[PDB]
Amino acid sequence: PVMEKLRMFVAQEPVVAASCLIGGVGLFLPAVVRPILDSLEAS
Amino acid sequence: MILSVLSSLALVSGLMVVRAKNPVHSVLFFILVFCDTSGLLLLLGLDFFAMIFLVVYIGAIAVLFLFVVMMFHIQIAEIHEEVLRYLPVSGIIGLIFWWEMFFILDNESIPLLPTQRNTTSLRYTVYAGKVRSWTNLETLGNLLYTYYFVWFLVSSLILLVAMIGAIVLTMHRT
């Protein structure tokens, strides 16, 4: 049941969770969004 | 002249690194040798390396040396020895290395003797290179992460080994 384990992990360690989220958005945007924009520009 | 002043400061400070009785003083004279090196780099126009020698050698490496040496409280008896007897061997080794290496460039890089004529008037200026000039920082950053990125990553592996080995060798968890 790994859904409240994430909830507890956020409750115990909010700074780690926030760092992972902020950095994860920073990694997600160039990985996923940027090729979408490059493709949308090609057509 | 200026290069002579910096060379003399570095020479005295290095002698004091290798000859000070107290190792704390040795680490402090080492900081002076790094400051002098930073000055030389500023003369060569490499201001990024001049700042990084301050940040890394003095700001981080010398600090680690100082922390370790200070907490060790070395006693002068455990490390003392008279060095008069090494003057001959130092003389021969240093003289061989001097005569051979202080003059290694002389055959290949012959110095231009300064004449009593203004040679500055023959400096040719090419303005095309000066329209958008690059700093040392961006010139290095243009190469580190693209054309030579593998060596960058191998250096990261070297740093990882340092972190692991530091923990494994010294950690005693409370």
Binding site: - | E108, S109, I110, P111, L112, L113, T115, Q116, G129, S133, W134, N136, E138, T139, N142, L143
Partner: protein, 65 residues
């Protein structure tokens, strides 16, 4: 200066000489065929012969004085 990357962000001072020497050596099966280009590259690197000649001029000036 064989890489091409200059320290101010342009082609290195001695890259063209290097490339001439390399292109000569790529098809000349004897290294002696590219000796002139090789010493051109090394002259660019160290300015040995130029400075030697200018020192000759300076020496002659000192001798005639």
């Amino acid at each position: 200066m064989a890489s091409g990357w200059g320290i101010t962000g342009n082609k290195g001072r001695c890259y063209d000489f290097w490339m001439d020497f390399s292109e000569c050596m790529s098809h000349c099966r004897e290294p002696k065929d590219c000796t002139l280009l090789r010493e051109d590259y090394l002259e660019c690197l160290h300015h040995s012969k130029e400075f030697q000649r200018r020192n000759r001029i300076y020496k002659e000036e000192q001798r005639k004085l």
